[model samples]
Target: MLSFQYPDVYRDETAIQDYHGHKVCDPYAWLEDPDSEQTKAFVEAQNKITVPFLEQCPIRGLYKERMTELYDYPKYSCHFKKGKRYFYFYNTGLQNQRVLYVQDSLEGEARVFLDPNILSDDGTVALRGYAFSEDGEYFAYGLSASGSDWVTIKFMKVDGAKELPDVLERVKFSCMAWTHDGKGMFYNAYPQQDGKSDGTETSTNLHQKLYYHVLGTDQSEDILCAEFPDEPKWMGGAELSDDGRYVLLSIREGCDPVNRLWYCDLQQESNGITGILKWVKLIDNFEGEYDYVTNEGTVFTFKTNRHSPNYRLINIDFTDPEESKWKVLVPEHEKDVLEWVACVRSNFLVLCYLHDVKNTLQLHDLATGALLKIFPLEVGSVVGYSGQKKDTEIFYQFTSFLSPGIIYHCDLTKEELEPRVFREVTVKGIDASDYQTVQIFYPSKDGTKIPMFIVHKKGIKLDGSHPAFLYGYGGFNISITPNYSVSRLIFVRHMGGVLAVANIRGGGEYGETWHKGGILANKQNCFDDFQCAAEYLIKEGYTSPKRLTINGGANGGLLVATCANQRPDLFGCVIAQVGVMDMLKFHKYTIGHAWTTDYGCSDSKQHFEWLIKYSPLHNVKLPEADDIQYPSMLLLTADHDDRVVPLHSLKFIATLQYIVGRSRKQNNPLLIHVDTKAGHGAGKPTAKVIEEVSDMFAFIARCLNIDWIP
Candidate 1:
């Protein structure tokens, strides 16, 4: 299975840290300082080998060609309104990134407002945040370098296509909001951190504070509005109401849904020359999530899970300030979880709910919380929808395994608002006339009936000899619903690959109960659930380990890594992209500390024990030598992935190569690919995406010994 020689890497055994009296050696701890020359050398060495190995795949060129053909299609996002103008994202064929387009009318000629592809030749600069002024005179946008969480804020004038002089830095994990008066905007960022990017305190990330940056003024002149000096770990977000009377402040600890909401009435107390001082509490307790929908004076309607496992809407009068006086607007349903709601024209609301991993949206009377009309959608997932309380037009997009994307336009002005297809894209090259998708319920290790969607060419036999591609993400309460992928369609066409996605625990497919079943101490349930899906595929005669490939990224990347480590016999190869492998120390990086709710930090003795049990970096065990060789693995990371960091994959691949390489040379391929000018997989250019997909598909095809039809 080894097609190329292994890369040379240095291992310093003394690199160890004690976690609650446990002594462990982190040989590649030197690699943690990505800024160091030594760390750069290690990365270069890995790339030296991985590049040639992947480039040598027999069908790599063919994969690239087919994927490029499939990717060369027009794509558009659902239009969002700022003032009277409509703005949308559009990608014409094979551009590096989506360009921002603005138009006066829905049927009018659209023109480019901002093109990120022109910002950087290699497309490393990405527009991560977009917000326009209430009058649509100026737009405040943040651009991230190399996909880094750190963003630089810039202003553009909509009237004349002019760039303003105002520039803001140190923006990360922040929400952007412009004042309706068009005077200033609010943002979040970390302090200087000892005045260091790489030379200073570059390890830990915390102490994020909110500030209001006034238009046409220097960032130094911005207002420091909100921060908890005593609680450095707590981060805050800023939001302005429709009436622009009060600025809502949302505080959070970790990445959970619960938050504490506070607000300062701007009319009573200004944001001040420096910042606002006085603020009032709406919901002081973070016991359960309280989503502020809209308010009539002091009477506020909120969607909360408070005592209801299935969330419900409740109206609370802040003037009375009594819990007994709170009225339930819409009571909770025992079977359904109330997910989200968006107000339209103040009289009606568009609400979304997850019914067995599929999204269904319905209109309801906002004042009475009574059902109005249900939008008839295909058996697919709603990517997202857009509408404001004062707006009469609602726009949303629905996507499925076969449909690339379909935009539905709903007019709230009409009492009989029937959904109309605003835009739909037809994927060229691939004929999906015979392709079929099927959803099935399978049991996990703990008897939980996990849902999985299987897709391939129609009339494929369950002969236990086909190549199956399984992908999943089972953390952060994220749902893996039906979505179209050009690469996946290519895989099925070329490889006849059985592509399946598992809706495992740790996801909000069913609701909070489903997420609780696979996170924290029950994290192992994710691995078990994934492995069980693989087992089901084999038992159902779809594929065995020799023909099955597993893929995941981010939190899901951790899912793929854990499953491959635990059950190597279930997969032929595993593809993990930017995974949080070293859970024992994930809290030490940028914004990773906020994920302790799902991964349980190693600081506590009990949490340390829990993390050490399955942390991919700490538990890199050699596969048992029996019938099958250790499955191939591809670890992906980038230099600017501050979210999860490349140190995780660096240390992990180092361990695997040292032990596994010395033990089994011809067993399976071990590799780590590091891309330049790229971070995590947020705003990657189309060229990079196609290249990576080509490599993975070719690698899996090589491992499965599948050849091109020609």
Candidate 2:
């Protein structure tokens, strides 16, 4: 029943321009009404569409209420310590939001260690927490007031009493790390600005200095690691070696993605805040480098070309200032993408990588640079990977597009795998095996190959009559790899709809080259790439424009907005979630200024002109009477999203409403939904997720004409 055809109407450039320039009043002005009927209707519709899908998803209850579950649902992070025990942090869906659970070195029940929130008034929100010392002697935790910016950091003894006096609340801390001697802690603090302290216009000019907090002492002095009076624009908190002898600091000037690694003698710095004794740049002009230090002051760094497709692992000795002392551990390989460099101990290193789309776990000898063993997991994507020592075993969590996440124990000494069932999830009256996942490749506007992961039901008709929804995020070098999501599986597969994940330009799938090709001045390439994928799907007889829907969030939402404007006839519906629409004025906001590294600044006259040329909000024009065709659009955002100010969406919807006349054309509904309580990418319990999924699908169903009474 499916056939391929390009609508002759699309060939008319004038019509395309007129449609792209449609004038409509902005829809964002309506979001200010929290109790509006529109807001309630939006929330109700979202849940209606998503809950059914979640109930039918294959891996629905795999991690919930199961006795032998290796990993529970909503797991935070997993680690293997001392090659004998596995440590994981997770939320037990209880009053205490988070807890650290320690399991056996091999396989056994997990024991709860630290519930940092026990000291809180009502355990409502524990914003930050940390663990210290390999021996687990010292522990530090932090708490923040309800919906407040300030956080109070406290330190305590792991084995000490569970009372109030046992904790030390001395300073306001943002991030902290333990010293090797376990005698003190290194923490960073950004002093509160004057009038802007309580307001949303918090100043970005914060002074982040590293300080040493000695136990049982009231004195905490600043450690002058760098001479720069003002904190670097892209600096990360300082980290110390396991021996506490050396401290490694990451300094990044300006908004450039490149970073430099510098280290100073911890002993000398601790003695006096005077002058810099001797400092060495371990890594310079290192693009995309994530540095991790071992006990011996050996910096195990993972570096990749920010403008190329290659990545390599290098080991640098802090003791040697000479650049020649830097040794190459894992040489850049063509087809392998190093996902993460987990742990390095003695002569061994464990790396989690993605070879093609499949997850590959590899162990290598750091001294010999020899590959010891390669374990390719057959289940879901590797969500978490960690180990205690370098030469010891590793623990990881794996889940597939349809499989619920499971924790596994890998013994490098034995080169074997063991399952650690933490929990199991089950859904009543749902068959999981009915769905299928297919990986496909499509060519972009410039013939550049784009990868897409399509999830659908098995035995589905090849006819293009079925509805296909494409999703993509093409900015910030973020990779949209295969991962399991119960809600998505339920919505797309069980409902007989196709869900496609587009790995287009502006993403890290093909490395930095792929990302850079679609950012800044070249951002148009991202929109074009997404459009080309939609075209390819139609051309391949997979789905037609009438049955096609597109969705994206954040930067990805920008892509969807641009694509919708560029080609209205290519899709039946569009979902822009927490999207950045007014490109011309985005930099004026809080976190939007920092995004100048990814999106070129719009403040400059030249940049302003360039931005206004394609900026969705600025470019909105009245559709000509002769050509007025627009696709249905759903703009979703959160009022509390400090990252990408809600004003971006607000102004955008306003502009769209003004430019595009309210006259209903082909029953196309353009709508916007604002969640008051959520921030950029809302967090928390199942209710929040269900509401989000439901709203998204409700919009899709309304646009695509899918009937679901439930």
Candidate 3:
């Protein structure tokens, strides 16, 4: 039997009596005095554990030699033709980014097409789309500033480089395509003020007409395709057919969710400057339903749960505009899970299906709906399909927890796989085989089973004494899937601590139904589900309340805050990272207003009452009159966190300090750390990530009194 301490009901008389008064009792009053030995010891002990962990991380030289090899980092998005080659953009770690142009020859190195400084004054540029004329004399590229809502269109010539400069300034550019005769490039731009708005009032007016820019002549003409009374919607996922006769446009509502496909005859519109052309709506709501699009305009594929909880593939044709002409090539069947579809070619579509968590890749003939070949991956493998070019083989990146990222090129003609060693990474003194992962499902408060992935060392005991850290994000339809993490490997696995990720409601792991169950007015379900998972761990004798810790950020931060307040006895320590502590007033902030779709605003009386019921900042109270016994917490925030606002943490810290100062037992103390440079979340640099992780582990060690070095 496990021995656990319960709150003293008899001694709670004074606190209970005081609770009857108008004022609420303070919960964390012990750390008010700066000279208090408890506060000194808490800070000192945390530093003692964290400093060592940081020292062991090998932070200085590891990124240069091991970052790309150890992590499945992002790469440049490349598109190549027989004679022309274009690489979208490359992010070199964090500080620098550039767009490179290369010849089609395999031996030719890439040339700097556009430096970062040319696009924006802040050196923030995103290369969205690029196209080269048939003669390879003219090229047009789309550029957007980082964190900006709109993209700008720029055109240049291969020979007359000085003549072609930045054409359109701060204009939303999309769907760039070159004409067959190489006379000019055609594209669409939405020029609406409301289109740039981040909140619900936002609308995408796709009614804007397409335009063509003549290369040598300065005359630009508009090709009006539609004149709808409704607001013009932003057009995306546009593709020009190989013959360059027709252009397909995917018009969607506010860039997401609702989408419709429209086709325009480019040759007929290019003949004259008369803004009159016939446009056909080929498919409705296609973008909202589908996941990926093929190179050819005829076939489009998507992963949807239209027929079942598990997603399956459905291919549609745009050649015929009639709705009845649409065909479902790959039908959804029981036990058939398809996702991450990439159209390798006009006839071939590569898809990865899951049997449980394991993945298998399949090459299918789109027109015949026939499975050509199947490739099985090793256990715990993850594969990502890259795009295909004419005559060039298709490639994919395969990775696992133990194995580093490896790219494989497949020859479709012979159906042979060739592994390419892009990079190799090895941790100097670390061993991979000692790590273990287990997927488990535990019951939530409503009897719904919640899935969690637990990772630890292989030889660790089943005894409940281990210091476990449970992490989760139960909102935003985010799925907590298994992926490699170097920081987690160092802090949790190597240190003999258990790291568990709970897939609670509010996430898309199970689909939209699961997400709906944990958002808006039903948000309580997410918090209850997290607490239930923690309780399940306790009931299973995996870890007791004194040894278990809970961590969450943003909306998940509110989860940790609410859980810690509602059932303080369940968690030994709590980490609230850039958390939304003041849920009642979240909408008052910048980005928080946009999140109203997930969490309804508290402006309404009903919502105000609902928010107040579980608002973490407003619910802090003393456990007893003389006893200040609450789980230790490390409230982390960034000064420039415009999303949630740093005041959320500041106010909560102030409230906790006031409450704890009023308590008699000055033993347990909470710590608050604020970073000056970062925003809601930190940036992508290795140093930033290491600093964030070190701070978190330091807080954990301080709370748990773990003696291990960093």
Compare the candidates by TM-score and give the number of the best one.
1
lDDT, residue 427, model 3: 53
After best superposition, candidate 3 residue 547: deviation in angstroms? 3.4
Residue 42 in candidate 2 has what lDDT? 40
Q: Per-residue lDDT for 426-530 in model 1, tens only?
A: 886777677888899999977989999999888888998888999999977787889989988888888878899999999878777787888889999999999
Off by over 4 Å in 2: 1-86, 91-98, 103-129, 142-156, 160-175, 194-206, 215-227, 230-232, 253-257, 270-279, 283-290, 293-308, 318-325, 413-432, 622-628, 664-666
- Candidate maximizing lDDT: 1
Task: Output the lDDT of residue 649, model 1.
Answer: 91
Give me the runs in candidate 3 sitting further than 4 Å from their true place. 1-164, 167-288, 295-309, 317-325, 333-337, 354-359, 379-384, 389-391, 416-424, 581-594, 601-612, 615-630, 635-677, 680-683
Q: What TM-score, over all chains together, does every model reach?
A: 0.97, 0.80, 0.71
Stronger candidate by TM-score (1 vs 3): 1
**Model 1: residue 561 alpha-carbon error in angstroms:** 1.2
Q: Each model's RMSD to truth, in Å? A: 1.8, 7.8, 9.1
Off by over 4 Å in 1: 1-3, 194-202, 270-274
Ranking by lDDT: 1, 2, 3
Clashes of each: 0, 40, 13
lDDT of each: 0.83, 0.60, 0.59
